[PDB]
Amino acid sequence: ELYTKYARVWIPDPEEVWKSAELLKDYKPKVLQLRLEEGKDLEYCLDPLPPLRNPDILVGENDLTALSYLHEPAVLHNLKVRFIDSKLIYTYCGIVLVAINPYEQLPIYGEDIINAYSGQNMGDMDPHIFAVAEEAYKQMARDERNQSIIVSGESGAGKTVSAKYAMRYFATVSGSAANVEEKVLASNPIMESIGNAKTTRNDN
Amino acid sequence: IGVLDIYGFETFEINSFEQFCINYANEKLQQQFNMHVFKLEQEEYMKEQIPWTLIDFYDNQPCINLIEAKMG
Amino acid sequence: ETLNATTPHYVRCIKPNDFKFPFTFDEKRAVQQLRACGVLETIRISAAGFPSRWTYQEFFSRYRVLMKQKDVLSDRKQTCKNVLEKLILDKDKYQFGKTKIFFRAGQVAYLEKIRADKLRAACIRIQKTIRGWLMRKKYMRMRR
Amino acid sequence: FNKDQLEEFKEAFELFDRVGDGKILYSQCGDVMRALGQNPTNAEVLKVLGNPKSDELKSRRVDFETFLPMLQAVAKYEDYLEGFRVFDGNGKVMGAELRHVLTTLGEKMTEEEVETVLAGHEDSNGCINYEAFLKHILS
């Protein structure tokens, strides 16, 4: 079981989907004594267990699969901490790259970083859109077989910014002069004017 | 090198044929993603010399057959 | 049939808050975005496997605290096979690859807990001994 | 403990008796146990003290006669060595690491206690011969 004294646990909460709690007395085979951040004991009941929490060394790692307990609140915690306190907008899950839209401009897109990623292997670095673009750009050279980057989300999330920088990366590591970046970016207003809508829940 | 920009899975208070199409497309893409991840895992396991039988494959084809197949 | 001709690479974008505040993160929105992008069911599928993959030397570095100085061999792979086969009795929790240990979800946290518990018991024993030494010396001062 | 033991222990107790009433505080009971060469945990001391509350722990006073059963109850090397070898395998231990763990884990001590006992026992690299320091502090 290993619900021991000073085991941390996650508990479901209406206001923020999960809150951290600490198991204030050992579990033994109905109700748990839980110490909360808000108050030293408020009590939680077990039904016909709370999600256990990862150890502090693991949280904040570059790749959500490095966690030992894989579940909604630990993922949400790792993304929240990495975004809020370290201002890292990029994180890995399995193969996938998760990009948390900061709504703020950042120095991380500079040409020195483009050089820093060029020629690296994928795991050698903290995740960045340039490291996906580089993995594609190397596999295209190593093999005949073509490559795709697939970007998914809501339209507000800023997929166009991801594609913009992935093209800037391709242009710079190719050493190209050509002029594709300007034209592809200048195509966006017509494609958005014809092909783009205001929904009940999102605009554009 | 292709850059594909597409909408995600979609769900609203009131839910209609537009969403049904979007969710069908996202079912197809998630099937492709599961194909790809499973393949690269069988490759990594043979890199590490570990028996393939330990990785279970999760398959959403029973859901796609509910939509696109005949009498769907 | 266009994408199947090709090798995919995937990105997911999530919207952290509905109001475009810089660097603020609404858990209630973000959970929904992560579900909608399939990230959560992806992680649920990954947790069924061996998620956690550790190189023998970094494992040995981390868990020598649990390892008796008798039992570390010159052979890292055999050393770790011994140690881990004692520490986690159900062999089904891990596989010994050529280059990496594979752990099921949860077991690396278990190993970290039992490591921390050993380190705590050792620290308590040492530090209580140092406390009793030091106050024994304060007693010798009071006798003086 | 016999009468001779009780007399030597009582004299020591009175040296720790800072009020003259022949009594110590709960918080001094552990101090007296430690003064006699024992290394009891805070938990063992509180258990033999009867898990006192903060108020009586800081102000209720007990004489030697009440302490004695508690000292008895508390009373009733290779593991210690391995405990020090955790933080090593060249036979050394960083002074910084031992200081941090002793002041932040377990029954945390003050930086001044650790500096006082460690003064002169660590070398220029900031390494402690833990077998020699341990034998020294166990004598």
Numbering used by the authors:
A (entry chain A): 5 to 33, 36 to 54, 59 to 187, 190 to 216
B (entry chain A): 433 to 504
C (entry chain A): 649 to 792
D (entry chain B): 4 to 79, 86 to 97, 100 to 150
Task: Pull text from the paper.
By using the actin cytoskeleton as tracks, myosin also powers cellular cargo transport processes and can serve as a molecular anchor and force sensor. The myosin motor domain consists of four subdomains: the actin-binding upper and lower 50 kDa (U50 and L50) domains, which are separated by the central actin-binding cleft, the N-terminal domain, and the converter domain, containing the long α-helical extension known as the lever arm. This coupling ultimately enables the amplification of small rearrangements at the active site to large, force-producing conformational changes of the lever arm.
By applying a mask including only the central three actin and two myosin molecules (central 3er/2er), the refinement was subsequently focused on the central section of the filament (central 3er/2er maps, resolutions stated). The remarkable similarity suggests that the same set of interactions is maintained during all strongly bound states of the myosin motor cycle, despite their varying F-actin-binding affinities. The actomyosin-V interface comprises six structural elements, namely the cardiomyopathy (CM) loop (aa 376–392), loop 4 (aa 338–354), the helix-loop-helix (HLH) motif (505–531), the activation loop (aa 501–504), loop 3 (aa 532–546), and loop 2 (aa 594–635). In summary, we demonstrated that myosin-V establishes a maximum of contacts with F-actin, utilizing all six potential binding elements. Notably, our data show no significant change of the helical symmetry parameters upon myosin binding, neither in rigor nor in any other state of myosin. In contrast to previous reports, our results elucidate that myosin-V hardly alters the structure of aged F-actin-PHD.
